[PDB]
Design a binder for this molecule. Structure first.
Ligand SMILES: CNC(=O)C[C@H](Cc1ccc(F)cc1)NC(=O)[C@@H](Cc1ccc(Cl)cc1Cl)NC(=O)[C@H](N)Cc1ccccc1C#N
Ligand SMILES: CNC(=O)C[C@H](Cc1ccc(F)cc1)NC(=O)[C@@H](Cc1ccc(Cl)cc1Cl)NC(=O)[C@H](N)Cc1ccccc1C#N
Ligand SMILES: [Cl-]
Ligand SMILES: [Cl-]
Ligand SMILES: [Cl-]
Ligand SMILES: [Cl-]
Ligand code: NA
Ligand code: NA
Lengths: 302, 302
């Protein structure tokens, strides 16, 4: 028992992290087979970053402008190209530690593990959720750009995120591994604002089920509400509306605990309207929305 | 910026996890050089577990009773011995992925990363603190015993914890890698209770400094208290007393933020006496005590 924010084991990804240097800019890259992927803004100077024209900047580069280091072993760049906001550097050596992998774009409300890296060296691993406004609330310092997010499914790594920038609000924005930004952001050093965020309702319900599985029952009640009457309460508290497919996704947890989804929604309605009155749920005094139903099932099997 | 519970990258440890089977009991072991370390209770049957005499049970075992699998490759056991509560199985192959490592015993109030494993296969990684009562609040299901906790310092892995059991309260107990239990526990299937726990004061202050570094300042005030007058408040709220060495350990963070330690203690006194009045600190509505000063500095460098 117990319930923790749990990242995937990071070993398969650690073997892929490299350092990419162009001029005086150094960030992280991802070395899979004979290609290194990294944020294209590595080619910009401090002046370029305000309003870069990346097509012009790349045409002015050559292979020998790119320094790639995998540990202390330098990798020779034999080709460079751009795909959306990612740079692809072809190298003369295939990474012998390339895992089975896929490039997948995730949905808001889904979670993934982040391997925070600096100068090509992994420093820590943690879970992130993609917010409804396409930002993530990560932990990143200067030098972290090019760090990647991923999920692992039967030894296949699904890469879903490459880190590009911290916004002025301290939240974080990046792309999928095809270089397409999550959300309404661009890779230039200008102040950009995310849209308004909302709380991920299905994840809060999943976490309430985790809590019941782990023995926290004080918030349960004998009431049951309707999907429509709950969604009226959700809108008032800036929660995403609940759909029938969310109820279906929550079916397994509802069956394991014997608490119908709409019964748990009555508990959530009361928690939103009255607070916790000084009590905690799974060690939190707030309603947690960064665990998916899958995260709960993976950790609360027993 | 941002502040997250961050584990160490787990790759160096993943390469050491194996499966150890004795009879119908399967758990995890740690394969370093030509030795596999695992909980000695793998040699017990269901009946033995109530009141095992491990010296008798081990003398009745032979090498061929132990099945060790590293992935799908079976390792041949060529010797067995017991050190306190850990079994040491000598194998005919040195682990080619053995990292530089040390066996270190940690102190209550310190943190470490846990690689949760099942059947020798790593499933997730997360941070734990050793509670003042020598338990950890982990996330472990059946089959997790033998999972290890560790810190990493300049590519040297310091192993500090091997998981042995879940207590009836749902918290977790284990040993150092010499097999010596943390706290007043024994490896037998009987109900055992931990001593009363307390909140780790220096860690709460470290986390308040993290919050200031990240822009949460609402709890600051112009007041400053004395070490003695704060410790009077600490005792009332079941907080560990603050020592001058704790003030010294907090010096670097105090200098980086410009907030004297005893000034931050005045803030903590007010937070304990009045609550948060509906506000949050680093995304929590509770005072967090599972980050050490080192954890904060490692993540809040910038
Ligand atoms: C208090 N917040 C900050 O100071 C972070 C500032 C916020 C800010 C944003 C826009 C602006 F006009 C003024 C300030 N952001 C950065 O400075 C960005 C600048 C940038 C560079 C490349 C590209 Cl394509 C876009 C941008 Cl916008 N630099 C990075 O993200 C670094 N690579 C990583 C980094 C460095 C330092 C701190 C955190 C992180 C991280 N993670
Ligand atoms: C609601 N809580 C539980 O049901 C867990 C129970 C609590 C309980 C404790 C004592 C008792 F008399 C009755 C119940 N504990 C276990 O059943 C232990 C039994 C045990 C075995 C070997 C050794 Cl040396 C000591 C013990 Cl005590 N089994 C394990 O820890 C497993 N290896 C791992 C495990 C299995 C299942 C659930 C969580 C975990 C984990 N992690
Ligand atoms: Cl957590
Ligand atoms: Cl793909
Ligand atoms: Cl966290
Ligand atoms: Cl040692
Ligand atoms: Na493609
Ligand atoms: Na020794």
């Amino acid at each position: 028992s117990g319930f923790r924010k749990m990242a995937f084991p990071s070993g398969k990804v650690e073997g892929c992290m490299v350092q990419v240097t162009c001029g005086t800019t150094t960030l992280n890259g991802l070395w899979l087979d004979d290609v290194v992927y990294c944020p294209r803004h590595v080619i910009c100077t401090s002046e370029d970053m305000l309003n870069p024209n990346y097509e012009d900047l790349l045409i002015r580069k050559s292979n020998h402008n790119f320094l790639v280091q995998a540990g202390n072993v330098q990798l020779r760049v034999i080709g460079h190209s751009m795909q959306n906001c990612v740079l692809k550097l072809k190298v003369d050596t295939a990474n012998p530690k390339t895992p089975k992998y896929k490039f997948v774009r995730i949905q808001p409300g889904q979670t993934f593990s982040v391997l925070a890296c600096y100068n090509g060296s992994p420093s820590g691993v943690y879970q992130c959720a993609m917010r409804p406004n396409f930002t993530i609330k990560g932990s990143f310092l200067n030098g972290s750009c090019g760090s990647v997010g991923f999920n692992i499914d039967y030894d296949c790594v699904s890469f879903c995120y490459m880190h590009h920038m911290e916004l002025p609000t301290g939240v974080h924005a990046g792309t999928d591994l095809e270089g397409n930004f999550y959300g309404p952001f661009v890779d230039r050093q200008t102040a950009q604002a995310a849209g308004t965020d909302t709380t991920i309702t299905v994840n809060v319900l999943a976490w309430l089920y985790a809590a019941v599985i782990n023995g926290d029952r004080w918030f349960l009640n004998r009431f049951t509400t309707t999907l429509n009457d709950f969604n009226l309460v959700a809108m008032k508290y800036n929660y995403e509306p609940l759909t029938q497919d969310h109820v279906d996704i929550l079916g397994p947890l509802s069956a394991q605990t014997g608490i119908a989804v709409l019964d748990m929604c009555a508990s959530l309605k009361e928690l939103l309207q009255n607070g916790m009155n000084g009590r905690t749920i799974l060690g939190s005094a707030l309603l947690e929305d960064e665990f998916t139903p899958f995260d709960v099932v993976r950790q609360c099997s027993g």
